[PDB]
Design a protein around this nucleic acid. Structure first.
Ligand SMILES: [Zn+2]
Ligand SMILES: [Zn+2]
Ligand SMILES: [Zn+2]
Ligand SMILES: [Zn+2]
Ligand SMILES: [Zn+2]
Ligand SMILES: [Zn+2]
Ligand SMILES: [Zn+2]
Ligand SMILES: [Zn+2]
Lengths: 78, 74, 74, 78
DNA sequence: TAGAACAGGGTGTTCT
DNA sequence: AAGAACACCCTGTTCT
DNA sequence: TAGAACAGGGTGTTCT
DNA sequence: AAGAACACCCTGTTCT
């Protein structure tokens, strides 16, 4: 079963979405910090396992698009 | 002038031997010397500039080659 | 009197058939009926009282048997 | 490699000591809550895998004796 | 599960 | 000019 | 890693 | 007296 962001092996729901480990800590770091990234292409870069380092801008976008949010643990509660 | 022929940064001088910045200089040596496998995530036409050249070394490397860089110019 | 012969709680009446509290009553049925394996973590002489009887069912059970409980007294 | 409290399979250092999972959450629950437990024996009960339920009093003691403490993560730091 | 934190890779600079 | 080398940033793992 | 939280076991009560 | 059955507590796992 697979990461919905990069299609590497999924390691569980994280921030509300079946993702792999690397995408989980990736999202968390982008959300807590600055995410002023530039796409060098057309904002549709291919994020898979070898290429996911290439474009943070598009990786973050695919994170948001897949529905990740930080408060999804204390917010998949109330 | 004084713009890198690859990323359009402020080119230090002439390297390998093209008007390139220092980043591209050393990048190029590393791309040819080691390996390394670079793959474009777009369309093999990425925008390469001071801030984006980090994003796609396949495309950076290709631009280096096409501006005629070569580890032996002397 | 009105003290459990097993744990010395306030014994409700006569069960299986010994002067026992209600806890020991139902405990005993469960110990014999199901199984379950109880093992003492001390020395097979545990203090059994209202608060400690929970701690060692091996010893509780043994005391039940030794006070002559039996699922058929009638 | 083994839990230093109950000798079940150890799952990592927890609260500063190689313990199994059950002893980790056991300690944590005893420390955050009330631990007014009574030993029914001589305060040397045998805490191994089947018997560790029998005497919280002695299990907790073996936890303290083995050196567990909550602030051992932010205190194996400074 | 969410989170800390280490080591590894890549990059760009300074300095020979 | 070309090379060495350090310090930085981002990443993805492990967390006996 | 530390932490939440669910389901399972055991117990003791109330109620027939 | 004996049994059913609920609600509680403690435990140890999983956390696609
Ligand atoms: Zn992923
Ligand atoms: Zn992109
Ligand atoms: Zn350049
Ligand atoms: Zn490219
Ligand atoms: Zn009793
Ligand atoms: Zn005992
Ligand atoms: Zn243990
Ligand atoms: Zn004990």
């Amino acid at each position: 079963h697979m990461c919905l962001v990069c299609s590497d092996e999924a390691s569980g729901c994280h921030y509300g979405v079946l993702t792999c480990g690397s995408c989980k800590v990736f999202f968390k770091r982008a959300v807590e910090g600055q995410h002023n990234y530039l796409c060098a292409g057309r904002n549709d870069c291919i994020i898979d396992k070898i290429r996911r380092k290439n474009c943070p801008a598009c990786r973050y976008r695919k994170c948001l698009q897949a529905g990740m949010n930080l408060e999804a643990r204390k917010t998949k509660k109330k």
